Amino acid sequence: VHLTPEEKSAVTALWGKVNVDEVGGEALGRLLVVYPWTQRFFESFGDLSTPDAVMGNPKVKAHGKKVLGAFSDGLAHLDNLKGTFATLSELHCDKLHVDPENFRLLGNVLVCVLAHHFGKEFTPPVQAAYQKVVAGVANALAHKYH
Amino acid sequence: VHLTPEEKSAVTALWGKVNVDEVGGEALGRLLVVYPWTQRFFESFGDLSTPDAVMGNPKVKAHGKKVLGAFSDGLAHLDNLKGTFATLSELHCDKLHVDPENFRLLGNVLVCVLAHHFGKEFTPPVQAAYQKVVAGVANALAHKYH
Amino acid sequence: VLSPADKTNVKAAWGKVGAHAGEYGAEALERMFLSFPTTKTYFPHFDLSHGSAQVKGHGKKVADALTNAVAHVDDMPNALSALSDLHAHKLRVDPVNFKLLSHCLLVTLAAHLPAEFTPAVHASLDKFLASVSTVLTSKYR
Amino acid sequence: VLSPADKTNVKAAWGKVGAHAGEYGAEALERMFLSFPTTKTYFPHFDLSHGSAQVKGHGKKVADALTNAVAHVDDMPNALSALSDLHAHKLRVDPVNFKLLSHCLLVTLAAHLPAEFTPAVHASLDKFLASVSTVLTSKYR
Numbered sequence: 172v173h174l175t176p177e178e179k180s181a182v183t184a185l186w187g188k189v190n191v192d193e194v195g196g197e198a199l200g201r202l203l204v205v206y207p208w209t210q211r212f213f214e215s216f217g218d219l220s221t222p223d224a225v226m227g228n229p230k231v232k233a234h235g236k237k238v239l240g241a242f243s244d245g246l247a248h249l250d251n252l253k254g255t256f257a258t259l260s261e262l263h264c265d266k267l268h269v270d271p272e273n274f275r276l277l278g279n280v281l282v283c284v285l286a287h288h289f290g291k292e293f294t295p296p297v298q299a300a301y302q303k304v305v306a307g308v309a310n311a312l313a314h315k316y317h
Numbered sequence: 318v319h320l321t322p323e324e325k326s327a328v329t330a331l332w333g334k335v336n337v338d339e340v341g342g343e344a345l346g347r348l349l350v351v352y353p354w355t356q357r358f359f360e361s362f363g364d365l366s367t368p369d370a371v372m373g374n375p376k377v378k379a380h381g382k383k384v385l386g387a388f389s390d391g392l393a394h395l396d397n398l399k400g401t402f403a404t405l406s407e408l409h410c411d412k413l414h415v416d417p418e419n420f421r422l423l424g425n426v427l428v429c430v431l432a433h434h435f436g437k438e439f440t441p442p443v444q445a446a447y448q449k450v451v452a453g454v455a456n457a458l459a460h461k462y463h
Numbered sequence: 464v465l466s467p468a469d470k471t472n473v474k475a476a477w478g479k480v481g482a483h484a485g486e487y488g489a490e491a492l493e494r495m496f497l498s499f500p501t502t503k504t505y506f507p508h509f510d511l512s513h514g515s516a517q518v519k520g521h522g523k524k525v526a527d528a529l530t531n532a533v534a535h536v537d538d539m540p541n542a543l544s545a546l547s548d549l550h551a552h553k554l555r556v557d558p559v560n561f562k563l564l565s566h567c568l569l570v571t572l573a574a575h576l577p578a579e580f581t582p583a584v585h586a587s588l589d590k591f592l593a594s595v596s597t598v599l600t601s602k603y604r
Numbered sequence: 605v606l607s608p609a610d611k612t613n614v615k616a617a618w619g620k621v622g623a624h625a626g627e628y629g630a631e632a633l634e635r636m637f638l639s640f641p642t643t644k645t646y647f648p649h650f651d652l653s654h655g656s657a658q659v660k661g662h663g664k665k666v667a668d669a670l671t672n673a674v675a676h677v678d679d680m681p682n683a684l685s686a687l688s689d690l691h692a693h694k695l696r697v698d699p700v701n702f703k704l705l706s707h708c709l710l711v712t713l714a715a716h717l718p719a720e721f722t723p724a725v726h727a728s729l730d731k732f733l734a735s736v737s738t739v740l741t742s743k744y745r
């Protein structure tokens with residue numbers, strides 16, 4: 172992940188103000204709502220027939236903090252998002268069969284939930300280091316696929 | 318790129334049989350025909366109004382040989398494509414202003430020319446190694462863009 | 464949008480496929496499984512080995528829908544609605560994968576139709592596949 | 605394909621941009637240039653620096669076409685005819701870029717309309733931006 176320290180110090184400093192709970196819950200539900208086909212992996216979660224049935228579901232919610240939960244930790248190893256994610260890599264592939272593209276989709280919803288939330292503070296330049304971050308994540312989550 | 322040795326052998330033995338002069342002319346010309354917007358860079362090559370005006374244009378035929386001879390030389394450096402292509406990366410960025418996605422268009426168009434020419438010999442596993450090689454070049458070429 | 468020559472071009476390359484469609488659909492699918500392994504995530508319940516008959520049976524399925532689209536080249540939206548319903552609401556196949564399979568299809572034809580796989584005809588088939596994938600993902604959201 | 609909830613939702617968000625649509629067209633361009641540097645290969649003639657006039661004026665051009673798509677939500681094809689033409693035959697931007705700039709328009713919106721950028725408004729704008737992108741690139745070949 173080609174990050175400048177400027178870029179990293181920017182990333183790290185914003186993250187620090189993240190409520191993972193609410194941001195991971197909002198991030199996974201916008202995915203389920205914006206790109207409705209990602210829903211194929213959660214029918215067991217319940218009713219997802221509406222933005223609100225979706226937004227409101229505890230399952231999506233708790234699956235959001237869980238997912239954002241592990242995002243938080245790779246930010247701790249931006250220098251090796253490949254070995255930080257290897258196991259989660261083979262489980263996504265080998266057990267859950269998730270197409271890595273969904274990974275790209277989430278990164279993009281993430282970046283829009285951060286903006287949503289930090290308005291004025293998530294600047295062209297802060298957005299851009301973040302874009303490098305969710306693309307190194309998608310890529311490290313995606314690299315043990317076979 | 319990360320090719321098996323059974324993958325870098327297959328790449329290499331085939332490549333062995335290609336006529337680069339005429340396969341560069343055929344892959345560059347099929348590009349300007351199937352992805353016509355790609356002509357944006359070749360205004361000075363003359364008439365490209367029809368498939369035969371493009372494919373038979375001697376400037377198209379002579380540029381295609383430059384491209385693949387270059388492509389051909391990174392085949393000797395599979396373990397160092399970034400280094401191999403870095404001055405052409407800067408050339409294409411800095412001076413020609415070529416959107417890197419052009420580069421992924423031509424590797425695919427290259428993959429269909431090989432199939433076209435080797436027939437049955439371009440098998441599923443030979444294609445999958447070339448798919449790797451061409452993505453390596455696309456990326457190596459796109460490395461230094463900024 | 465398919466022009467009169469795209470149609471003619473596709474009516475003609477597809478016409479030589481003739482009886483190998485199935486064979487060829489099966490090959491398009493292995494090409495895809497191998498080159499773009501992320502595509503296997505949709506066929507977890509399949510056997511994805513060389514010659515699996517699940518593969519041979521799925522390929523022909525695919526090839527028959529192409530063959531039908533070709534035959535209804537003037538109404539593809541209706542010809543395939545049924546398939547779009549399916550893909551939009553039950554398989555929920557990320558759009559990106561249509562483009563990878565259309566490419567393994569172009570490679571397969573290229574490889575079997577030496578003679579017919581002209582620049583002009585390559586172009587047509589590319590637009591063709593692209594409009595069948597567009598029809599198929601039309602009801603996604 | 606916009607449903608009536610979709611168009612309603614886009615009419616609404618868009619109404620709130622009002623007067624800043626240009627301000628936002630320009631920072632959408634500025635986020636793109638920085639997050640997706642490759643997009644820069646199309647503006648080699650522009651000063652791309654912060655607060656450039658070129659970018660700013662370009663921001664408004666684009667904002668106004670968006671606006672003009674909101675108004676003609678039911679006839680984009682015709683509302684945008686001149687523009688597809690411009691993009692397909694002269695500019696020739698590679699289609700993949702339409703999605704990078706759509707995404708920057710989303711961020712920008714999100715960051716300036718927190719109360720209204722709800723999940724369904726978000727989903728709507730997204731489908732919007734996707735069909736204007738499809739209309740721009742509809743005559744490429």
Ligand code: HEM
Pocket residue numbers: 209210212213237238239241242259263267269273274277278308312
């Ligand atoms: C964006 C990066 C992502 C990260 C870091 C991530 C992380 C995780 C983690 C930490 C788990 C818990 C696994 C366990 O029990 O050990 C998980 C499970 C799972 N993830 Fe991912 N996730 C990501 C994206 C996605 C996306 C985009 C999808 C699909 C839309 C997805 C689908 C799933 C599914 C279906 C499970 C199984 C949940 C269960 O146990 O029911 N993940 N993920």
Ligand code: HEM
Pocket residue numbers: 355358359380383384385387388405408409413415419420423424454458
């Ligand atoms: C894909 C692998 C490619 C390689 C190895 C390659 C190689 C080259 C070489 C060696 C040159 C001449 C450099 C010079 O004059 O110093 C060149 C020039 C050029 N390249 Fe590429 N190229 C590739 C792809 C592309 C693609 C896909 C496009 C765009 C459609 C493109 C557009 C250009 C242009 C416009 C020129 C300059 C032609 C002129 O006016 O002389 N190239 N390339």
Ligand code: HEM
Pocket residue numbers: 502505506521524525528529546550554556560561562564565595596599
């Ligand atoms: C041009 C594109 C495509 C065509 C014409 C096509 C056509 C078909 C047809 C005819 C079926 C059989 C339905 C039946 O049982 O009646 C099917 C099923 C299926 N397709 Fe597609 N498809 C296309 C693209 C894709 C892509 C790109 C993927 C995944 C990467 C995909 C994944 C599936 C899956 C998982 C099934 C379920 C089959 C089973 O379990 O037997 N399709 N498609």
Ligand code: HEM
Pocket residue numbers: 643646647662665666669670690691695697701702703705706736737740
């Ligand atoms: C939402 C999608 C887009 C819309 C509504 C849009 C709209 C416009 C408008 C309204 C113009 C002004 C033409 C005139 O009257 O002079 C224009 C020009 C232009 N567009 Fe687009 N555009 C879009 C996507 C793109 C993308 C993604 C790029 C490149 C990454 C792009 C590159 C250009 C360039 C280079 C110009 C001309 C610059 C100049 O000479 O000022 N456009 N576009």
Ligand SMILES: O=C(O)[C@@H](COP(=O)(O)O)OP(=O)(O)O
Pocket residue numbers: 172173318319
């Ligand atoms: O992800 C990659 O492309 C790299 C590295 O370098 P960066 O280009 O990420 O700076 O390892 P590779 O995947 O080629 O084996």
